[PDB]
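COMPLEX REQUEST
Ligand: protoporphyrin IX containing FE
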Amino acid sequence: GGIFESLYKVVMRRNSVYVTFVIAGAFLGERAVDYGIHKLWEANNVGKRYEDIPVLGQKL
Amino acid sequence: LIPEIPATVAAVKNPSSKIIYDEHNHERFPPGDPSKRAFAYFVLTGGRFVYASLIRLLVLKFVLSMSASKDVLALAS
Amino acid sequence: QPADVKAAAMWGVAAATGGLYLVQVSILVLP
Amino acid sequence: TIRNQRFSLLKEPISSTLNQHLIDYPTPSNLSYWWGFGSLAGICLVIQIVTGVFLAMHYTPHVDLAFNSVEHVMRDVEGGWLLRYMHANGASMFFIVVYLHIFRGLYYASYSSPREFVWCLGVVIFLLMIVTAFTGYVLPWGQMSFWGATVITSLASAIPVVGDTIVTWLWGGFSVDNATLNRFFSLHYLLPFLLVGASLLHLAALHQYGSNNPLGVHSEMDQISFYPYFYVKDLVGWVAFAIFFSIWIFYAPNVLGHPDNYIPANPMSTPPHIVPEWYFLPIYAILRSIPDKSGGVAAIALVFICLLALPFFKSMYVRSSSFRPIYQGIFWLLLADCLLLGWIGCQPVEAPFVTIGQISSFVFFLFFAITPILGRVGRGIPNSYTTD
Amino acid sequence: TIRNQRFSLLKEPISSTLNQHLIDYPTPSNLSYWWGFGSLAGICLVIQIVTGVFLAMHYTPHVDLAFNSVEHVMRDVEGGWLLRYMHANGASMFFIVVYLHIFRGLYYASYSSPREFVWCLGVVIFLLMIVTAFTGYVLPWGQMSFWGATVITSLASAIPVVGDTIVTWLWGGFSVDNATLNRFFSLHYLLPFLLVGASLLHLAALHQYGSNNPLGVHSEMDQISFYPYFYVKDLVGWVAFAIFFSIWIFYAPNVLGHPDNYIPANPMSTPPHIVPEWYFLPIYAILRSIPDKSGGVAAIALVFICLLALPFFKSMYVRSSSFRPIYQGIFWLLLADCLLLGWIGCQPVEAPFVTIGQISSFVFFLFFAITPILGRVGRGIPNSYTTD
Amino acid sequence: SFLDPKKNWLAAQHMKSLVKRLSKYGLRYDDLYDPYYDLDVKEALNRLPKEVVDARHARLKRAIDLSMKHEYLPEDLQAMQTPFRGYLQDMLALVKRERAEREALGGLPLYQRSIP
Amino acid sequence: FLDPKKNWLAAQHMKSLVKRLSKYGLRYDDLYDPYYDLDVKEALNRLPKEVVDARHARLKRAIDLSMKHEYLPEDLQAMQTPFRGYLQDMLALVKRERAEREALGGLPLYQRSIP
Amino acid sequence: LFARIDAVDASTIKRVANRFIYDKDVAIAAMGPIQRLPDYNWFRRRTYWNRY
Ligand SMILES: CCCCCCCCCCCCCCCCCC(=O)OC[C@H](COP(=O)(O)OCCN)OC(=O)CCCCCCCCCCCCCCCCC
Ligand code: HEM
Ligand code: HEM
Ligand code: HEM
Ligand code: HEM
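STATUS: Structure written out below.
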């Protein structure tokens, strides 16, 4: 309760500040979700990516 | 005795501080308690995060679909 | 009027942040 | 209230019509989530229009370039695969939500008075949707598109007096060829805007008489404004639909499709299984089930005759099926029969599917031929169950 | 009057809005034929839409097939030369009628209050017409088509920071090739429906605030219904326009065009005389007259800013030009200037045409800069001319 | 034929189900007649006493409120409910009979439905 | 400002306006549209009913003549008072009241509706 | 009392209103033909401005 009220009085007294907060949070959350999903992808399929084939540079 | 005053008339003529609501699918808070006004606003803030991200995605997808293509990019040497 | 100026400046900041988030010119911004 | 000076920018003439008909239009306070489908078919239409325009910036309606152009959108265009999958699966979603719209109307008897014009404009919208989806499906110029177009347009020669003349005029020649492809592309581009106009007339009529409700009773006693009470409800509906659509775009983008369409059309070879999209299947099933193909076209016309004749039946004062056990069971049987008939359409025309489709069509028409009888008999209920 | 039983179909809810806004709308009794020009512009838009649809049933948006497809329309399609000549010369007549519409508005000061919104929506409509006609003229893919597209799209590079990016994005691939052709076909097909929406909003705002009259005075004393009194006047206008347009279609169909558009586009050589269509010539002349192409683009933006800034002037009490001799002369000088400006745009940049254009554009802006002065002095008039 | 719950088990079950539903939402069978539906119900409601029509509106509002809240009438009032205690069928029959007579011999409709 | 009785051009302008206005049988004040300014509306509301009704009659006559494509007969053209104004004083008073009301913290008594 | 009263300026009024009015809960009591009076959510939303 106290934490929510404190952040409320921080960032919910002017709608311009609220819109800036919404946009910044959307950007940061998008980047964080990108990073998490990429880490899950790497963990799941290991040994299949392009820079993993043993002979990637020997077709010359 | 004789009148049997109607329910609405009796309610209007007798205001009382023991007000009773429905409380079927929405339970009341105890009478002395602060309103959780900020928590709802932060929930809505998370939703708005998501909505803004989706709108941004859609606009960029359409506009950059109208942009150049790998065919012409590879053709240009 | 000073309050209106502050509100207009804050709204301009918000709009600039929105445009920056939409375009993502982080590469472009050299200075 | 003399409007000497401005109070609210919503009530100014620039925003007054929108104010009234969107923000302040009173709606019954007990509407369920089944009205969100009416709110959601419009969103599907908008999605289709936008994705279609951005696709048409890349499609070539010639007969030697249509398939390669679609593959160009698939591969070379940045985000093009998203556009094409959105357009196809969005046609599918449009039809799904419109079917849910129609069936809620049937369950709650929304077609009854005084919304006959609403139902009739809905039927016209259904015709427009069917024609648009078909002529659009011919565009990618695959095996299924070419041969479905051939079969369906050739089955317009069942009309006695004209027949071949109309077919030749429609084809622009003697067979489904480049002229038909170009014609179909132009018509596919045009028709959705007539569909927007028809949707606007649909909404205008409904707003003239107001929306129904689950109880089916007069509901001008307890009403609330549209915004914000139903805006948030429709928002929940839209987000759920977005999750469904995102599943159907990113994980099963071709499940609703037919694999033979990824073969360039070849007029000298016929695919073993010529069938339309899943959302033309019940109509196709009725058409095939009735033999003597002229009779099949007559039956297809009769389907729309019945749909248009639904709102003009007998007394049937009680309308909601929550208080009509017999009509409730009849509605569930109708829905089951429509699903079964849709299943039959994809099946071959061998046995026993012929008999199963012939019985199913008869049940489907029996639904329309039985409801007036239900109304006539139920007109005299209160006199029989009265507790006097 | 309680509407117990229905008297007239026109007052029924199905035809009530149409009744009001088409049959029963009160109109000033003294309107001349330029209001007929407004209706005529509407008809020209409808003609363009219909002929364009039927043309797009035969046009291939590919770079290798567009020109030969148009020659197909002219030579092989049954009565296709009529469709193409109707579309092209109908674009020309659409612009002629809209110009007469605009100049009547300027003469009678119809832009004044309370029709500022009507004038602004008209300006938006004019922008949409310009864009639609330009992208459509790119479609036939001739020398003039390709090179005009190149020049007019490449002058978008004048934007300070994002000019080159916008040019490349609109081009789609460093040139004006097939990608630009498909893009322009899709946009040309889409825009007329937005134009229809803009026209409907235009008419709605006007109908809100009535209609001006040749006197500019309040006109709620003597008003008559629109039908049949102004339908017949508009009909006379329509028949005269049909005769004019039939003169253009059948006897002189290529006078309003340039012969360079009958040569297939060859990006190697450059035709010696690159000019847009005749109805873009005044704008082209202004832009060419002011050098430093960034200044030219700024000047076009300034033209549209002035056009949008006409309605919001300060005093401007007397409206019509019948009681404003100074403004009457100013308007006639402006019209002569506009005609001269249009003629300059077809001439080369060799002298003296540079001086003539740099004077004509200045005079154009001078007209737009000396109307408030006349309004203020006129506001000063009444307390000087009193006869007592 | 005329099938009543006394002489028909199926009619008895049908009446029982209708009684159960109407009692759940606490509104009489006559309250389901929409005035916008027929315009004869509109006239019949215009001819009824104000107390009766006000009771009808109150019952309908209660039913709509219960429908929104996704709940049913409490079991007390549910046992106190009296569906099929009609108040409108006689007046509706009179109105329809009068309309039939007027139509049968000369006469213009006293009221008509707008289009649409 | 040297308009009247000292400017040949202004004299010519007055002559032309008199000719045109008397030709249609109007007055200068009748050219003031109530919908244009919303101060003309208040002035016309405040003016006496006889004056307003005469204004409306003159406007209707002018519109009738404009429809018929003809002018007043020479007799009524002679009996014309194109510049016998009736609105300037009331309009100036209304404008002055508006001026003070905006000068010291007041809401407008009427505003233009956004179209 | 006068000193306390005229020690109230515009900033004090704004601060007190923000303490008491900005985004607080209203209590409405109405009777009569109030079928056109807006509901609770309407007032509760009108207690703040989104422009500032
Ligand atoms: C070389 C560089 C400099 C170039 C410019 C230099 C010259 C500037 C202008 C000089 C002349 C200005 C004349 C102004 C006074 C006009 C007097 C007037 O109104 O006379 C009345 C006359 C009425 O006409 P009518 O009714 O036919 O008369 C019969 C009478 N029983 O009314 C008339 O006849 C109407 C005359 C209207 C004339 C309007 C145009 C001239 C005045 C404004 C000039 C603005 C120039 C810039 C803008 C041009 C347009 C864009
Ligand atoms: C003006 C709006 C529209 C435009 C411009 C448009 C344009 C196109 C184009 C260019 C194609 C071919 C590209 C492709 O095959 O993916 C296409 C295909 C299609 N369109 Fe549309 N369309 C529009 C609206 C609609 C609507 C409203 C529907 C649904 C009723 C629809 C249904 C389809 C279908 C089913 C296909 C076939 C998709 C496939 O199988 O590849 N279109 N449309
Ligand atoms: C383009 C597809 C369609 C759109 C966009 C559409 C849109 C709408 C909208 C917005 C409503 C009001 C909201 C609602 O009640 O759910 C509505 C209601 C309705 N529609 Fe449609 N509709 C479509 C197709 C149909 C069809 C095909 C029919 C039937 C033939 C139909 C029949 C109805 C009926 C009966 C209602 C009244 C709902 C009620 O009972 O209150 N609609 N529609
Ligand atoms: C698509 C082209 C256009 C169409 C269909 C159109 C249609 C109309 C119509 C139907 C009217 C009412 C009838 C009339 O007064 O003539 C009208 C009036 C008007 N239009 Fe347009 N218009 C168009 C373009 C423009 C443009 C470009 C402008 C100027 C920017 C404009 C400004 C006006 C004005 C000021 C009126 C008021 C008429 C009056 O004062 O009596 N229109 N228009
Ligand atoms: C949705 C309606 C419309 C469609 C489908 C359409 C379609 C087309 C097509 C396919 C062409 C090329 C055919 C040819 O070369 O003759 C064309 C040309 C053209 N269109 Fe449209 N058009 C439409 C509306 C308009 C409108 C409103 C204008 C504006 C006046 C316009 C202006 C032009 C012009 C200037 C050309 C080039 C004329 C020429 O071929 O030389 N179009 N249009």
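REMARKS: DSSP finds three helices and no strands in chain B. The two ends of chain B are 103 Å apart (CA to CA).
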